[PDB]
Amino acid sequence: SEQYWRFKLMTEGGCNQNEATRLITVLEESINKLFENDNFCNRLSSYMAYGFGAAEEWIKKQQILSNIQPLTPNIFGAAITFGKSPVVKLLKQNAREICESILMDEPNLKQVEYIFRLLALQVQETYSGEQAEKLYECIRDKKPIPSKFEEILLPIVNRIKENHTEILNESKRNHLGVTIQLNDPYSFSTKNSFCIWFSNNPNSAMPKKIKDILEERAKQNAPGVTKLVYSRACLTKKENTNFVQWAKENGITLLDFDELKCQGEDLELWNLAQAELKAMREGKGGNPAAASDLVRWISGVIGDVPIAYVDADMPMLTGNKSIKSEEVYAGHPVLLNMGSALVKDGVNLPMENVAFNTDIINFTGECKDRSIAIKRIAQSLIGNYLHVTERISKSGNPELKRLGLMPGYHQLLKDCEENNNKLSLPMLRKALTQAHSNLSSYVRFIGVQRFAEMVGAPEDAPLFQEALQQGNTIVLTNALVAYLVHGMDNVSRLNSSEKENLIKKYLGTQLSLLYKPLVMEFSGPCAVTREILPLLPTGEPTRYIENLKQPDAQILRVLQTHACVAGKTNFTSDNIPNWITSSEEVERTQSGLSWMPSEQARLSK
């Protein structure tokens, strides 16, 4: 996300590295609407000419940005500004020629701009020193193209074009240690499935409406297996017997994973999942979705025949529009759920942001390659649990980066080392929960600085410290409520209770912001996504090209066609977008997961 923003600010916003970075700290990653058009960057470039303070100040007084419309050695920025430069039109010439080779139809205007800026930036990356400055002045002064510049540009042209024409080789298709094959040799079932449910309520093994969903899945799936993994240690004896009979009467294959005998990685995952479930039962920060996230990848849980993992409540495309054949094929042994979102980027092609999820995972039958990919995932998740503080420290997650700066977090680490205890994930989750149970521990945990900036009063951080010190809680209350109900006048219209419940809701929201990554980043899909990233080019953004003659030149098209569950199952998920979904259609997010704090404080009480 951030990489591109900074590129824009340095190419079109008149910023340098340093002040472009300062700009993003002074700028939610909802900034990104400002870049689908030039308007913000054009005006910010005008203010940039008069110093960084000029731009900074314009931003704080501007009512709200995205409301910006026109008024009344940067080779790349010069190539896109100066449209009549004999060099810039030899770039556009080459851009259009490359496209008629690599494309299927008559190039779009966005499609030439895409290749054009590719050429321009590579030319900026091939020139350096005085020969960079000379051609920058040549761009601005519309001097004719230098001799032998068309030979500097020929190897560039042939690479952008061959990058968009050749099939990616096997070294760029290595996904979880297994090559993504284009002939789809791996076979899958559309009928076998398993799901997982570790109840936090010993007297109710599984909610009734999820039981109904599984009764439907077992019936639709015919003779295929509908497997349900659970933990006997989480139920009462009476409830377990009821559960076992319910599964028997509805064609559901129960697997009590407590009885599994595991070795190697399997046993490492089994031990960690049992630890989570034990810490859940004891009210010590354990989470049943974290346990499910791990048990997902145990070989004895998955089994030997092709089978899909699905979330227990995952619906199905039952009927005349479903897949009738029991067997399908794909190019990888482990198919994760994938989609992508298109980010508008002005006159260029839209950026394509791929999404990964573990809510559906299609496994092929037992084989060496499936074992390679599974172990690659398992080692990752096990590695996250053995190095909790090291992962938080390196995390790219914003909420986890903030966690590393909180004094309560530093204090927690010191206690653990003073008492020679390694910080466990449940320990951290437990600690955060307790900390968010009152305003005072909360402010103490996060620090007054952080508190002050959150409630709009950075200058009062010393004041909050003293009130904290001497125990004057009403100022923390009122400072927080005043930021919530927009003004100190409004807080006075409220009694004890309505102000006390606005603080509980707010504290709960802040806890969820940290709780959610404390599952997803270690055992969940974000941890799985971190293991997959290495496959993606990291050097230019991925753009959606609609009609490549060879679509298998782009990694996202290889993933979409050969390494994901799309078109390979009857299960229907709305947790991530479908492939190439417009950023607007990802408004779907507008209208608490079963495993977060709230809902888990419900599913028994």
Side-chain angles (χ1 to χ4, degrees):
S1 231
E2 272 198 28
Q3 186 161 3
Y4 192 57
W5 292 341
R6 174 183 27 236
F7 175 73
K8 218 73 132 66
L9 305 159
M10 298 176 59
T11 42
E12 330 198 47
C15 296
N16 80 5
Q17 238 195 295
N18 299 143
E19 59 204 11
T21 46
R22 316 187 219 160
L23 177 143
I24 305 152
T25 161
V26 51
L27 254 193
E28 180 202 349
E29 282 94 16
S30 165
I31 77 94
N32 178 70
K33 308 340 227 107
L34 316 164
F35 298 109
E36 78 170 295
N37 58 26
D38 306 346
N39 287 347
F40 176 76
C41 280
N42 282 343
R43 174 89 85 266
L44 172 93
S45 174
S46 300
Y47 276 108
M48 225 47 225
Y50 300 105
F52 179 84
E56 170 162 0
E57 226 279 324
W58 160 63
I59 280 157
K60 40 166 117 163
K61 182 74 214 265
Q62 193 64 293
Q63 231 108 278
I64 90 121
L65 302 163
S66 66
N67 279 358
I68 302 325
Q69 101 188 15
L71 285 144
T72 88
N74 188 187
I75 295 186
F76 180 90
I80 69 176
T81 307
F82 297 110
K84 16 98 239 280
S85 322
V87 161
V88 167
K89 297 253 225 183
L90 175 63
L91 305 178
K92 304 287 262 293
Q93 185 190 133
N94 285 272
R96 305 201 29 101
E97 294 177 358
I98 307 195
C99 282
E100 314 180 322
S101 150
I102 66 173
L103 285 208
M104 250 160 209
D105 301 334
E106 312 92 292
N108 206 286
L109 280 178
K110 301 224 215 290
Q111 305 181 287
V112 316
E113 189 88 13
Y114 163 71
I115 295 290
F116 162 66
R117 304 192 173 213
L118 281 189
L119 286 161
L121 183 171
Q122 199 56 34
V123 153
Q124 166 170 282
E125 292 284 346
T126 290
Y127 279 81
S128 144
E130 165 85 5
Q131 278 289 353
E133 180 226 21
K134 171 148 54 152
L135 186 105
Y136 163 79
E137 295 180 357
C138 180
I139 284 322
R140 172 210 65 204
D141 299 335
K142 286 141 268 92
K143 297 228 84 48
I145 81 112
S147 139
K148 162 147 66 165
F149 162 78
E150 287 183 285
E151 144 204 354
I152 279 170
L153 184 133
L154 188 61
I156 293 182
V157 153
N158 292 331
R159 261 249 65 89
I160 290 79
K161 165 156 51 142
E162 135 183 25
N163 282 349
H164 292 69
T165 304
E166 305 166 342
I167 312 268
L168 291 172
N169 51 42
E170 294 190 358
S171 38
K172 308 176 182 202
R173 292 190 259 125
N174 192 257
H175 177 46
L176 304 179
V178 167
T179 302
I180 303 179
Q181 258 101 53
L182 277 57
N183 61 342
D184 288 349
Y186 300 93
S187 73
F188 295 78
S189 170
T190 63
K191 278 176 165 53
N192 297 331
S193 85
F194 80 96
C195 66
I196 297 165
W197 193 261
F198 300 131
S199 168
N200 69 334
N201 183 347
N203 287 297
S204 190
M206 159 170 308
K208 193 256 173 192
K209 69 179 226 72
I210 296 182
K211 275 185 185 184
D212 286 6
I213 287 168
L214 279 148
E215 290 167 16
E216 254 336 280
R217 191 180 298 157
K219 291 173 39 82
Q220 278 311 306
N221 287 353
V225 181
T226 295
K227 181 163 55 192
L228 169 42
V229 186
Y230 79 116
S231 184
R232 156 76 185 94
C234 295
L235 310 175
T236 70
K237 193 142 186 124
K238 171 185 284 254
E239 179 62 9
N240 177 72
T241 297
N242 180 277
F243 199 39
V244 164
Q245 297 180 320
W246 164 79
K248 280 155 167 295
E249 302 310 33
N250 292 277
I252 294 171
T253 301
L254 227 48
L255 170 53
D256 171 17
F257 105 118
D258 293 352
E259 292 308 323
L260 276 169
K261 299 302 156 36
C262 302
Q263 299 302 134
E265 297 77 27
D266 279 357
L267 184 62
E268 319 210 60
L269 291 168
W270 193 85
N271 282 332
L272 300 165
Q274 289 295 345
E276 286 279 6
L277 290 182
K278 172 182 185 140
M280 158 191 98
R281 288 187 308 261
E282 295 174 358
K284 286 156 123 202
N287 185 276
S292 171
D293 283 343
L294 299 171
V295 168
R296 209 158 308 205
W297 298 102
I298 292 177
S299 76
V301 160
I302 300 162
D304 284 337
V305 311
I307 194 171
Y309 166 81
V310 306
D311 279 352
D313 54 24
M314 179 73 51
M316 219 180 345
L317 275 177
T318 278
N320 181 95
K321 276 163 177 299
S322 90
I323 298 165
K324 283 202 48 217
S325 175
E326 195 273 344
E327 184 185 67
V328 297
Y329 290 84
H332 197 273
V334 183
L335 312 172
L336 297 150
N337 201 8
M338 294 179 193
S340 82
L342 295 184
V343 181
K344 232 158 327 162
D345 180 15
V347 315
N348 203 339
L349 279 181
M351 263 157 318
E352 187 175 12
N353 283 326
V354 64
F356 304 105
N357 207 355
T358 55
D359 57 341
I360 307 166
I361 308 163
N362 220 1
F363 296 94
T364 197
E366 189 208 281
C367 60
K368 247 291 279 185
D369 293 353
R370 192 189 83 171
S371 292
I372 289 169
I374 286 172
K375 169 192 221 165
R376 179 69 60 79
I377 294 300
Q379 289 182 324
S380 228
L381 307 190
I382 297 154
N384 296 334
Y385 270 74
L386 287 192
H387 311 297
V388 169
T389 87
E390 174 212 333
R391 297 287 193 266
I392 287 154
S393 149
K394 308 319 151 202
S395 165
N397 182 284
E399 304 297 346
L400 293 190
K401 279 147 92 269
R402 297 186 196 105
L403 172 63
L405 299 167
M406 305 180 174
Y409 180 64
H410 300 151
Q411 185 58 40
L412 189 77
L413 292 197
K414 198 167 135 193
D415 308 355
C416 290
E417 278 300 82
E418 272 180 15
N419 194 259
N420 257 268
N421 270 29
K422 202 192 80 229
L423 178 63
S424 91
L425 217 35
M427 268 151 59
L428 182 50
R429 295 197 208 104
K430 191 50 192 324
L432 294 174
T433 284
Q434 263 268 346
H436 289 59
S437 71
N438 91 344
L439 190 51
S440 266
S441 320
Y442 171 80
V443 172
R444 199 135 26 209
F445 196 102
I446 75 163
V448 278
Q449 208 113 327
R450 172 73 179 158
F451 175 64
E453 307 197 79
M454 276 176 89
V455 314
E459 60 281 13
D460 284 344
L463 193 81
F464 303 139
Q465 185 65 242
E466 189 187 278
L468 207 54
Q469 206 74 253
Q470 61 190 55
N472 164 39
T473 300
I474 180 61
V475 65
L476 298 182
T477 301
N478 292 347
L480 177 43
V481 185
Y483 162 85
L484 293 171
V485 310
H486 301 295
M488 192 57 187
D489 40 49
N490 297 338
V491 329
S492 53
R493 321 262 183 72
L494 316 178
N495 52 25
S496 277
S497 327
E498 65 202 282
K499 255 205 255 144
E500 181 23 64
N501 288 233
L502 271 188
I503 274 164
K504 300 300 100 180
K505 163 168 164 36
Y506 173 84
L507 290 183
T509 301
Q510 306 314 304
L511 173 65
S512 287
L513 280 175
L514 279 170
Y515 199 105
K516 194 142 124 188
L518 290 196
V519 170
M520 286 170 77
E521 295 284 351
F522 292 77
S523 68
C526 290
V528 165
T529 294
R530 188 164 69 247
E531 192 67 28
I532 293 160
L533 284 188
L535 162 69
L536 295 155
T538 211
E540 198 91 34
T542 48
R543 315 232 176 221
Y544 179 50
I545 322 175
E546 177 171 85
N547 58 40
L548 276 153
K549 295 174 150 186
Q550 190 40 269
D552 285 329
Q554 288 204 282
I555 183 59
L556 289 189
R557 301 287 75 73
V558 164
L559 289 169
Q560 175 183 6
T561 297
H562 300 287
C564 72
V565 309
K568 316 289 180 163
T569 38
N570 293 322
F571 299 107
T572 323
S573 179
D574 53 16
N575 290 324
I576 59 167
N578 303 334
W579 277 102
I580 61 192
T581 303
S582 44
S583 74
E584 305 80 355
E585 186 178 289
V586 205
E587 59 83 346
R588 309 281 170 163
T589 190
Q590 198 47 299
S591 285
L593 302 321
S594 60
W595 48 268
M596 286 283 275
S598 223
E599 327 284 301
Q600 297 271 114
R602 205 271 293 149
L603 279 181
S604 47
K605 217 268 209 203

PDB file of all heavy atoms in Angstrom, residues 448 460-472 475:
ATOM      1  N   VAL A 448       0.295   7.776  28.297  1.00  0.00           N
ATOM      2  CA  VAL A 448      -0.481   8.990  28.186  1.00  0.00           C
ATOM      3  C   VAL A 448      -0.274   9.658  26.867  1.00  0.00           C
ATOM      4  O   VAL A 448      -1.156  10.265  26.375  1.00  0.00           O
ATOM      5  CB  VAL A 448      -0.213   9.987  29.296  1.00  0.00           C
ATOM      6  CG1 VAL A 448      -1.006   9.636  30.511  1.00  0.00           C
ATOM      7  CG2 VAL A 448       1.252  10.072  29.583  1.00  0.00           C
ATOM      8  N   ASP A 460      -1.895  17.643  26.514  1.00  0.00           N
ATOM      9  CA  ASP A 460      -2.283  17.319  27.878  1.00  0.00           C
ATOM     10  C   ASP A 460      -1.702  16.000  28.367  1.00  0.00           C
ATOM     11  O   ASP A 460      -2.032  15.572  29.480  1.00  0.00           O
ATOM     12  CB  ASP A 460      -3.807  17.311  28.002  1.00  0.00           C
ATOM     13  CG  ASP A 460      -4.395  18.719  28.049  1.00  0.00           C
ATOM     14  OD1 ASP A 460      -3.633  19.684  28.290  1.00  0.00           O
ATOM     15  OD2 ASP A 460      -5.616  18.862  27.841  1.00  0.00           O
ATOM     16  N   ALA A 461      -0.828  15.358  27.588  1.00  0.00           N
ATOM     17  CA  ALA A 461      -0.158  14.148  28.068  1.00  0.00           C
ATOM     18  C   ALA A 461       0.518  14.338  29.422  1.00  0.00           C
ATOM     19  O   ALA A 461       0.334  13.478  30.299  1.00  0.00           O
ATOM     20  CB  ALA A 461       0.845  13.651  27.017  1.00  0.00           C
ATOM     21  N   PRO A 462       1.262  15.426  29.683  1.00  0.00           N
ATOM     22  CA  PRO A 462       1.774  15.610  31.052  1.00  0.00           C
ATOM     23  C   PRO A 462       0.659  15.719  32.080  1.00  0.00           C
ATOM     24  O   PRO A 462       0.775  15.165  33.183  1.00  0.00           O
ATOM     25  CB  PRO A 462       2.588  16.912  30.952  1.00  0.00           C
ATOM     26  CG  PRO A 462       2.038  17.611  29.744  1.00  0.00           C
ATOM     27  CD  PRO A 462       1.696  16.519  28.791  1.00  0.00           C
ATOM     28  N   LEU A 463      -0.452  16.367  31.716  1.00  0.00           N
ATOM     29  CA  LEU A 463      -1.568  16.498  32.646  1.00  0.00           C
ATOM     30  C   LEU A 463      -2.158  15.138  32.983  1.00  0.00           C
ATOM     31  O   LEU A 463      -2.340  14.808  34.163  1.00  0.00           O
ATOM     32  CB  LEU A 463      -2.641  17.409  32.046  1.00  0.00           C
ATOM     33  CG  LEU A 463      -3.735  17.920  32.987  1.00  0.00           C
ATOM     34  CD1 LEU A 463      -3.203  19.090  33.754  1.00  0.00           C
ATOM     35  CD2 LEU A 463      -4.992  18.340  32.232  1.00  0.00           C
ATOM     36  N   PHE A 464      -2.383  14.302  31.966  1.00  0.00           N
ATOM     37  CA  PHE A 464      -2.942  12.985  32.232  1.00  0.00           C
ATOM     38  C   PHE A 464      -1.999  12.181  33.117  1.00  0.00           C
ATOM     39  O   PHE A 464      -2.447  11.478  34.034  1.00  0.00           O
ATOM     40  CB  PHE A 464      -3.225  12.253  30.916  1.00  0.00           C
ATOM     41  CG  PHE A 464      -4.149  12.999  29.989  1.00  0.00           C
ATOM     42  CD1 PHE A 464      -3.900  13.041  28.624  1.00  0.00           C
ATOM     43  CD2 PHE A 464      -5.260  13.659  30.482  1.00  0.00           C
ATOM     44  CE1 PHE A 464      -4.747  13.727  27.766  1.00  0.00           C
ATOM     45  CE2 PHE A 464      -6.112  14.351  29.634  1.00  0.00           C
ATOM     46  CZ  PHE A 464      -5.857  14.383  28.273  1.00  0.00           C
ATOM     47  N   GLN A 465      -0.685  12.340  32.916  1.00  0.00           N
ATOM     48  CA  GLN A 465       0.267  11.608  33.745  1.00  0.00           C
ATOM     49  C   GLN A 465       0.079  11.942  35.219  1.00  0.00           C
ATOM     50  O   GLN A 465       0.040  11.041  36.067  1.00  0.00           O
ATOM     51  CB  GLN A 465       1.704  11.904  33.317  1.00  0.00           C
ATOM     52  CG  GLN A 465       2.741  11.059  34.075  1.00  0.00           C
ATOM     53  CD  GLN A 465       2.605   9.567  33.776  1.00  0.00           C
ATOM     54  OE1 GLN A 465       2.340   8.750  34.667  1.00  0.00           O
ATOM     55  NE2 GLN A 465       2.781   9.209  32.514  1.00  0.00           N
ATOM     56  N   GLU A 466      -0.056  13.237  35.542  1.00  0.00           N
ATOM     57  CA  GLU A 466      -0.239  13.637  36.937  1.00  0.00           C
ATOM     58  C   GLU A 466      -1.554  13.109  37.498  1.00  0.00           C
ATOM     59  O   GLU A 466      -1.588  12.517  38.583  1.00  0.00           O
ATOM     60  CB  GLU A 466      -0.175  15.157  37.071  1.00  0.00           C
ATOM     61  CG  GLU A 466      -0.150  15.631  38.521  1.00  0.00           C
ATOM     62  CD  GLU A 466      -0.248  17.132  38.649  1.00  0.00           C
ATOM     63  OE1 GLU A 466       0.785  17.813  38.497  1.00  0.00           O
ATOM     64  OE2 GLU A 466      -1.362  17.649  38.887  1.00  0.00           O
ATOM     65  N   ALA A 467      -2.654  13.324  36.773  1.00  0.00           N
ATOM     66  CA  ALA A 467      -3.934  12.762  37.194  1.00  0.00           C
ATOM     67  C   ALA A 467      -3.849  11.252  37.374  1.00  0.00           C
ATOM     68  O   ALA A 467      -4.383  10.701  38.345  1.00  0.00           O
ATOM     69  CB  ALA A 467      -5.009  13.105  36.178  1.00  0.00           C
ATOM     70  N   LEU A 468      -3.196  10.566  36.432  1.00  0.00           N
ATOM     71  CA  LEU A 468      -2.911   9.147  36.605  1.00  0.00           C
ATOM     72  C   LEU A 468      -2.129   8.917  37.892  1.00  0.00           C
ATOM     73  O   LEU A 468      -2.505   8.086  38.726  1.00  0.00           O
ATOM     74  CB  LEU A 468      -2.143   8.616  35.391  1.00  0.00           C
ATOM     75  CG  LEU A 468      -2.282   7.129  35.061  1.00  0.00           C
ATOM     76  CD1 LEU A 468      -3.751   6.747  34.923  1.00  0.00           C
ATOM     77  CD2 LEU A 468      -1.494   6.770  33.797  1.00  0.00           C
ATOM     78  N   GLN A 469      -1.080   9.686  38.084  1.00  0.00           N
ATOM     79  CA  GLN A 469      -0.242   9.560  39.238  1.00  0.00           C
ATOM     80  C   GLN A 469      -0.998   9.700  40.521  1.00  0.00           C
ATOM     81  O   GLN A 469      -0.858   8.882  41.416  1.00  0.00           O
ATOM     82  CB  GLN A 469       0.796  10.649  39.205  1.00  0.00           C
ATOM     83  CG  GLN A 469       2.068  10.318  39.938  1.00  0.00           C
ATOM     84  CD  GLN A 469       2.908   9.321  39.183  1.00  0.00           C
ATOM     85  OE1 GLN A 469       2.988   8.162  39.570  1.00  0.00           O
ATOM     86  NE2 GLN A 469       3.500   9.749  38.083  1.00  0.00           N
ATOM     87  N   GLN A 470      -1.774  10.764  40.631  1.00  0.00           N
ATOM     88  CA  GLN A 470      -2.528  11.035  41.852  1.00  0.00           C
ATOM     89  C   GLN A 470      -3.945  10.460  41.851  1.00  0.00           C
ATOM     90  O   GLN A 470      -4.701  10.728  42.792  1.00  0.00           O
ATOM     91  CB  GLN A 470      -2.555  12.542  42.153  1.00  0.00           C
ATOM     92  CG  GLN A 470      -3.194  13.427  41.112  1.00  0.00           C
ATOM     93  CD  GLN A 470      -2.953  14.902  41.395  1.00  0.00           C
ATOM     94  OE1 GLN A 470      -1.811  15.343  41.537  1.00  0.00           O
ATOM     95  NE2 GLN A 470      -4.033  15.672  41.477  1.00  0.00           N
ATOM     96  N   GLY A 471      -4.334   9.699  40.828  1.00  0.00           N
ATOM     97  CA  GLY A 471      -5.607   9.001  40.866  1.00  0.00           C
ATOM     98  C   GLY A 471      -6.851   9.831  40.619  1.00  0.00           C
ATOM     99  O   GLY A 471      -7.911   9.516  41.170  1.00  0.00           O
ATOM    100  N   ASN A 472      -6.769  10.860  39.779  1.00  0.00           N
ATOM    101  CA  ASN A 472      -7.894  11.759  39.509  1.00  0.00           C
ATOM    102  C   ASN A 472      -8.553  11.293  38.214  1.00  0.00           C
ATOM    103  O   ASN A 472      -8.249  11.782  37.127  1.00  0.00           O
ATOM    104  CB  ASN A 472      -7.428  13.212  39.436  1.00  0.00           C
ATOM    105  CG  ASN A 472      -8.449  14.132  38.782  1.00  0.00           C
ATOM    106  OD1 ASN A 472      -9.653  13.993  38.988  1.00  0.00           O
ATOM    107  ND2 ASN A 472      -7.966  15.077  37.982  1.00  0.00           N
ATOM    108  N   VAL A 475     -10.823  13.233  34.983  1.00  0.00           N
ATOM    109  CA  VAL A 475     -10.237  13.925  33.837  1.00  0.00           C
ATOM    110  C   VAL A 475      -9.999  12.958  32.676  1.00  0.00           C
ATOM    111  O   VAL A 475     -10.221  13.308  31.510  1.00  0.00           O
ATOM    112  CB  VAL A 475      -8.959  14.680  34.255  1.00  0.00           C
ATOM    113  CG1 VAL A 475      -7.903  13.733  34.695  1.00  0.00           C
ATOM    114  CG2 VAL A 475      -8.442  15.533  33.114  1.00  0.00           C
TER     115      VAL A 475
END
